Design a binder for this molecule. Structure first.
Ligand SMILES: CC[C@H](O)[C@@H](C)[C@H]1O[C@@H]1C[C@@](C)(O)/C=C/C=C(\C)[C@H]1OC(=O)C[C@H](O)CC[C@@](C)(O)[C@@H](OC(=O)N2CCN(C3CCCCCC3)CC2)/C=C/[C@@H]1C
Ligand SMILES: [Zn+2]
Ligand SMILES: [Zn+2]
Ligand SMILES: [Zn+2]
Ligand SMILES: [Zn+2]
Lengths: 160, 113, 85, 182, 289, 76, 209, 47
RNA sequence: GCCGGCUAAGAUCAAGUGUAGUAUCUGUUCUUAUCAGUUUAAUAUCUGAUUCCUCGAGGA
């Protein structure tokens, strides 16, 4: 897990030897793994590249971070408001700093991860201090231009 | 509905002294003739007049379609000793698994000797 | 009981009948006859003088090994006459 | 009056070829010695199985037969014969000892399609058009995993870059064969 | 003359038949441009039944005349018709069709027959692939030395047929391997033959008599084409296996390898070290002038 | 019964084995036909006679004498 | 210059590299046949000609895939070498050498035998000469068989099958056949006996005397 | 399928001291255990 | 084959049908158990010995 780098944000043009060919300049990528879905039978955008040394994986994570690969925000990492279609290049501290401009955050946010890879699932949950920050996130942040990924902010629970 | 997959062939015109055995030989020269599953007596029909008179027309159904297309390009416009035959895909206008599998096993490639 | 004789072969030439004329005695092939068949002296004697080596009918022509059997030196065993017990 | 596996492993020069049943042979020392000869592929491995050499799993259901490339590219004259003997290639072949068994069928440069899908323009004549991963290499330094790699702008000059080649590896006789047709 | 001549081919006298076939053969060899190709097709389809004749001269003349007619009208149409006929008929007619395909492929180079025959193996239906395999078997047996240019083309098909669960598939593929091995010998085709041996060998533990017979035939053909050293290398580790089944099979194969080419094996035996009681090293071969 | 006859003829040929063949029989068989092959091939005997500095008749006689009991006497 | 070739008494050939800066001798290739090597000759950077105690000559070449920079699959080395030539001579060869014999001629492989014989193996330069000589050998194998009952193809395949060698000692026996059989042989090659004789003499005078 | 119990090799148990005297079942599983995690763990104990 | 398991993973003993040959189908049973011998690469197989609980009954 230390020598392997988890890549997120892969489109349909990216393939299993294509990621190994793109990561060959960063370091000696020994193997590439792409988990296939059960309903569609294709990649879900997240994969893994197992290299030989941890320094090559660190250089690939520091070089290929927030890159625009196949029209997709590909990024390598070390393997009541709901935000969907978020970029995997952002972290919890980056999401807390991005959410601090609209309103005040009550605590540190959390992002959902896949049970197989564990880098990024695609959705996240963040809680605001009051309902005014949630309304400002649903008015402004729900549709704002993020890092090559159109996010969507919505309410997790609402009572009619 | 079934446009192709028609294993029946229609022999337009034949000598009026045609027997059944000479006809089934003519037809067996081009493949295996399908047999009625409940019985013997290959599925071959000699069309007859209101009497014993022979109209001179014949029907023959085959096991497979390739044998039909074989008879089409080898029997059509070919002369038996006296007469000129005509061959066409038969027109129609108006137990099972056991013997099906047997006739299939007639095409086997099993070890002999 | 289809067994070859496998005795020391002599100067007698093997014969084939009208039904077996083109056949190879060992593998029953019909392609490329190559080597003349020799039989032992007990297979060539008296009433056995001219006889098919495969079946035993009246011989009409020479028996041959095929090129495939000649390449594998299967013509170097004994008398290839089919004998029944 | 028969060896144990660990006892026989102590006697032989090569213990990793010893197996469970090897101690039950009539002459295990000769068996293990022949198992270590510098050749001699081993036994087909399904002698002890109980499934008649054809595994009924692994999803063998697949395409019937994929003809070679030379198959596709009167019916064809001596010119298409010329084509079939110019296109004829040698297929993949396994060497002397690679036996088959039931299971063993399933188990600086960028492509033009990936560069077109990623939104990267083509290489100009005399300018600086780096990939977006090259800015991190120009800021932090060269990668220690591949020190011999050259990039345009940092180590390679701008006029280099030609087509889709955005990098080159520069690693720091009488090679002609002897008897060959002319 | 020829349309008057074609009904005599069905006469049942031997001299009449032989002379008629010879005459039609001469006509097809020299005067081929005087009669339509459809009548030639009918005549060849009629000649198909004479390959079963009880007499050798009839078969010889029929082979000659079929070769001439095939050389005349072209391989494409006759090959299509022969494949259709191989698909739908009884045993003897299918065997005669196989012989006819081999004849067509020998007169008109097998380059013209092999693609259409391999395209028929692509049909997803048994009893069609087995016919293609029998035709390939007889084709290689019939062309012999000419096959040295076509071993690379049929290797993946033989791989597929040897990986198959059907027994007739593997038996016929073994027969093909045997005929191909004995056909090319001294022509430098050892790579593909070793590759195919890697797929033939796992079938030695087969109980079915026909399959094991074909496997033994293929092994004895590879003993000639590939050499006894490779066969001894395949037998060494099983000669002294703990199981009696493995020992029986391997000693049968070894005795077959030993009876043929006993002399070559002298240079191939592996070194066996002396024990306390007995001396096993051959010291003369260790001399160094 | 043709296969059974082949199984009896293969056993008949001297030098063939079976599932009960021991190491000693195998090794003496290959030693014996090695000595016969040396006697047959003219340039192998030349090599040996040059190597050990003997006449070729002497090497032939030595090989014939070694033919009797190669690999020592059998077990038990 | 870079590599070392080792001959084993019973194994054929081992390829070794000397690491000048690491002071290491590493085995990176070997063969798949047992050979009782008597002598060896380097033909180029990848190919070796070998001889045998049993009277055989062979040529072994490294595949183009071969990696030299190494730091077993058959209880041997990881990479293997391919055999591209096999020939039985009938006598034990003790000397092999690549050289040019006549002034202004071509390079040949000269060998020497324990019975006092001297011979050469020369390469073909075109496919037409190779095909013509192959057909000559094929037709002379049948219509002029060896005198003591031996099969010619089986004799040159004594220990290993022949690979890519034409027996020119069988081919030059054409000049000593009777005119009727010389015509029967020549009319199959679409040629006359004098043309075949001239073609046989050309390849000999190109290399040797 | 009590018949598979004795046909596949069960009811015959093997134990390994390198693996906590862990007793394994029929030979197909017992031969595979040396590659599994628990045996690697037990072997690392000795080094 | 499906998401370790759902007893389609094996052997066997009687009968029917049928082929030149291979075969195909039904009832079954499958020791749920131990020891000794034979045997098997190891299984397998074969050869012999081996009072209580519950509501007259059943199970061990
Ligand atoms: C697998 C197929 C079957 O075994 C099948 C042959 C056989 O089971 C049937 C029964 C039966 C009696 O009908 C068989 C028929 C026989 C044949 C079709 C053979 O024809 C003959 O016997 C004719 C005659 O004996 C000799 C003709 C001949 C020399 O061409 C012979 O074939 C050959 O020897 N070849 C094969 C090699 N070929 C090349 C061509 C270049 C120069 C000639 C030699 C090399 C030449 C012709 C016959 C071939 C038929 C298979
Ligand atoms: Zn034969
Ligand atoms: Zn007969
Ligand atoms: Zn006899
Ligand atoms: Zn353990």
């Amino acid at each position: 897990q230390d020598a392997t780098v988890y890549v997120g944000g892969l489109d349909e043009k990216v393939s299993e030897p294509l990621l190994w060919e793109l990561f060959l300049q960063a370091g000696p990528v020994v193997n590439t793994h792409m988990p296939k879905d059960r309903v569609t039978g294709q990649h879900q955008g997240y994969g893994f590249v197992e290299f030989l040394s941890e320094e090559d994986a660190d250089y690939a994570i520091k070089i290929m971070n927030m890159i625009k690969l196949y029209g997709k925000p590909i990024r390598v990492n070390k393997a009541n408001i709901f935000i969907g279609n978020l970029d995997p290049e952002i972290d919890e501290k980056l999401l807390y700093d991005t959410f601090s401009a609209f309103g005040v955050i009550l605590q540190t946010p959390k992002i959902m991860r896949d049970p197989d890879t564990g880098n990024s699932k695609g959705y996240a949950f963040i809680n605001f201090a009051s309902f005014d920050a949630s309304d400002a996130a649903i008015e402004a942040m729900n549709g704002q231009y993020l890092c090559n990924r159109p996010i969507t902010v919505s309410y997790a629970f609402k009572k009619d | 509905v079934e446009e192709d997959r028609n294993t029946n062939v229609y022999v337009s015109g034949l000598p009026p002294d045609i027997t059944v055995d000479e006809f089934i030989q003519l037809m067996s020269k081009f493949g295996i003739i399908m047999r009625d599953p409940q019985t013997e007596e290959f599925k071959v029909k000699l069309y007859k007049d209101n009497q014993g008179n022979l109209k001179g027309d014949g029907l023959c159904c085959y096991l497979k379609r390739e044998s039909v297309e074989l008879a089409l390009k080898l029997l059509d416009e070919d002369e038996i000793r006296g007469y000129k035959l005509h061959v066409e895909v038969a027109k129609f206008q108006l137990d099972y698994k056991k013997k099906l599998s047997m006739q299939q096993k007639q095409l086997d490639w099993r070890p002999e000797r | 009981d289809l067994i070859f004789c496998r005795k020391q072969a002599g100067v007698a030439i093997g014969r084939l009948c009208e039904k077996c004329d083109g056949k190879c005695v060992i593998c029953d092939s019909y392609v490329r006859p190559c080597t003349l068949v020799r039989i032992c002296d007990e297979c060539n004697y008296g009433s056995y003088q001219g006889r098919c080596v495969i079946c035993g009918g009246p011989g009409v022509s020479d028996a041959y090994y095929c090129k495939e059997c000649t390449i594998q030196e299967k013509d170097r065993d004994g008398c290839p006459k089919i004998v029944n017990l | 009056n028969r060896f144990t596996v660990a006892e026989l492993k102590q006697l032989v020069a090569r213990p990793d070829v010893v197996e469970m049943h090897d101690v039950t042979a009539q002459d295990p020392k000769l068996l293990v010695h022949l198992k270590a000869t510098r050749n001699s592929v081993p036994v087909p491995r399904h002698w002890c199985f109980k499934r008649k050499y054809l595994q009924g799993k692994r999803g063998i259901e697949k395409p019937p037969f994929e003809l070679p490339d030379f198959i596709k590219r009167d019916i064809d004259y001596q010119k298409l014969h010329d084509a079939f003997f110019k296109w004829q290639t040698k297929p993949k072949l396994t060497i002397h000892g690679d036996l088959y068994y039931e299971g063993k069928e399933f188990e600086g440069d960028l492509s033009d399609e990936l560069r077109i899908s990623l939104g990267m323009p083509v290489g100009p004549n005399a300018h600086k058009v780096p990939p977006p991963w090259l800015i991190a290499m120009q800021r932090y330094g060269p990668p220690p995993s591949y020190p011999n790699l050259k990039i345009p702008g940092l180590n390679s000059p701008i006029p280099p870059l030609y087509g889709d080649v955005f990098g080159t590896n520069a690693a720091e006789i009488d090679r002609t064969p002897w008897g060959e047709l002319e | 003359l020829l349309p008057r001549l074609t009904p005599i081919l069905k006469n049942r006298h031997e001299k009449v038949q032989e002379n008629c076939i010879d005459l039609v053969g001469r006509i097809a060899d020299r005067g081929a441009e005087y009669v339509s190709a459809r009548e030639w097709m009918r005549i060849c389809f009629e000649l198909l039944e004479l390959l079963k004749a009880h007499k050798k001269a009839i078969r010889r003349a029929t082979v000659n005349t079929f070769g001439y007619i095939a050389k005349a009208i072209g391989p494409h149409d006759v090959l299509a018709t022969l494949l259709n006929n191989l698909k739908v008929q009884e045993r003897q007619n299918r065997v005669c069709t196989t012989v006819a395909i081999a004849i067509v492929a020998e007169t008109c180079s097998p380059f013209t027959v092999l693609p259409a025959l391999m395209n028929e193996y692509r049909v997803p239906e048994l009893n069609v692939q087995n016919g293609v395999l029998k035709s390939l078997s007889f084709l290689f047996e019939y062309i012999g030395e000419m096959g040295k240019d076509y071993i690379y083309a049929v290797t993946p098909l033989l791989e597929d047929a040897l990986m198959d669960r059907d027994l007739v598939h593997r038996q016929t593929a073994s027969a093909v391997v045997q005929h191909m091995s004995l056909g090319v010998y001294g022509f430098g085709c050892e790579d593909s033959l070793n590759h195919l041996l890697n797929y033939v060998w796992p079938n030695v533990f087969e109980t079915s008599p026909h399959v094991i017979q074909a496997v033994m035939g293929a092994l004895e053909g590879l003993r000639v084409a590939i050499g006894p050293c490779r066969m001894l290398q395949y037998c060494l580790q099983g000669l002294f296996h703990p199981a009696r089944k493995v020992r029986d099979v391997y000693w049968k194969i070894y005795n077959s390898i030993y009876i043929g080419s006993q002399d070559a094996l002298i240079a191939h035996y592996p070194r066996i070290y002396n024990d306390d009681k007995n001396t096993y090293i051959r010291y003369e071969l260790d001399y160094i002038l | 019964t043709i296969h059974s006859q082949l199984e009896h003829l293969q056993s008949k040929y001297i030098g063939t084995g079976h599932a009960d063949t021991t190491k000693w029989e195998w090794l003496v068989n290959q030693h014996r036909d090695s000595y016969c092959s040396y006697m047959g091939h003219f340039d192998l005997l030349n090599y040996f006679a040059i190597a050990e500095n003997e006449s070729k008749a002497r090497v032939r006689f030595n090989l014939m004498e070694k033919m009797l009991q190669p690999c020592g006497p059998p077990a038990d | 210059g870079h590599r070392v070739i080792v001959s084993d008494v019973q194994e054929s050939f081992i390829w070794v590299r000397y690491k000048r800066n690491e002071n290491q001798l590493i085995i990176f290739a070997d063969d798949t046949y047992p050979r009782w090597v008597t002598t060896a000759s380097l033909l180029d950077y990848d190919t070796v000609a070998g001889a045998d105690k049993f009277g055989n000559i062979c040529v072994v070449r490294l595949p183009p895939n071969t990696n030299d920079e190494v730091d077993g699959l058959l209880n041997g080395a990881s990479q293997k070498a391919e055999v591209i030539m096999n020939y039985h001579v009938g006598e034990t060869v003790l000397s092999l050498q690549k050289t040019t014999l006549i002034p202004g001629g071509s390079e040949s492989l000269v060998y020497t035998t324990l019975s006092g014989g001297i011979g050469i193996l020369v390469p073909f330069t075109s496919h037409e000469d190779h095909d013509f000589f192959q057909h000559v050998e094929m037709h002379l194998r049948s219509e002029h068989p060896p005198l003591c009952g031996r099969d010619h193809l089986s004799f040159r395949s004594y220990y290993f099958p022949v690979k890519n060698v034409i027996d020119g000692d069988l081919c030059e026996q054409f000049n000593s056949m009777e005119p009727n059989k010389q015509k029967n042989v020549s009319e199959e090659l679409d040629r006359t006996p004098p043309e075949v004789s001239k073609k046989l003499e050309d390849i000999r005078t190109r290399y040797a005397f | 399928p009590y018949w598979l119990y004795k046909l596949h090799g069960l009811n015959i148990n093997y134990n390994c001291e390198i693996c906590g005297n862990y007793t394994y079942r029929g030979p197909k599983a017992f031969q595979r255990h040396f590659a599994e995690w628990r045996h690697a763990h037990g072997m690392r104990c000795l080094g």
